């Protein structure tokens, strides 16, 4: 019952998720930071948005409120956290 999916991660894991979701005929959404302006995972998805234009490139991926702001403004009904960022974060799921 999922129309489109967002990946709250970057790099190899994101690309793995986009490939899985596109196989399930589900639209894909990717986020990036200031220093990942040209990371591979930015291009392998259907939709790509910049998170935290003001916040640093390290903190950008770990900003619970701003990642939700992107998902909301894109009709995203499912987010895959990946691993080693907000994957073990409780208040992100809530």
């Amino acid at each position: 019952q999922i129309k489109k999916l967002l990946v709250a991660n970057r790099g190899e894991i994101a690309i793995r998720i986009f490939r899985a979701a596109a196989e399930l005929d589900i639209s894909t959404v990717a986020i990036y930071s200031n220093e990942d302006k040209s990371s591979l995972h930015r291009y392998k998805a259907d939709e790509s948005y910049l998170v935290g234009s003001d916040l640093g490139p390290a903190e950008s991926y770990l900003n619970i409120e701003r990642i939700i702001d992107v998902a909301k403004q894109a009709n995203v009904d499912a987010i895959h956290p990946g691993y080693g960022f907000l994957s073990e974060n409780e208040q992100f799921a809530r």
Binding site: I2, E12, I15, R16, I26, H80, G82, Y83, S87
Partner: protein, 96 residues
């Protein structure tokens, strides 16, 4: 020891011997689908077995000359493999 409540990096290694796609199934569980259903095609508990062996290596930018510490720079040349048995879930290293 502990519980990792998500997919790990070394997940690929298991998929190859079992046959089952972990990441795919993750999305399918989110939709509310049954395990042994027509959508996941997960085999039964005594139907899941390992085929052969599998080994994983992570390709970072670490080396014993700088004692396993990353470096900055444009990746001038990227040479990748492929073929039978070799599985490539890439993401970071390319043209330059």
């Amino acid at each position: 020891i502990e519980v990792n409540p998500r997919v790990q990096v070394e997940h690929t290694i298991t998929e190859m011997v079992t046959g089952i796609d972990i990441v795919k199934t993750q999305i399918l569980v989110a939709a509310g689908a049954d395990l042994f259903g027509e959508e996941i095609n997960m085999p039964q508990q005594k139907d899941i077995t390992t085929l052969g062996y599998a080994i994983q290596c992570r390709i970072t930018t670490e080396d014993p000359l700088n004692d396993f510490m990353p470096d900055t720079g444009t990746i001038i040349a990227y040479r990748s493999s492929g073929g039978f048995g070799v599985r490539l879930d890439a993401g970071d290293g390319f043209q330059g």
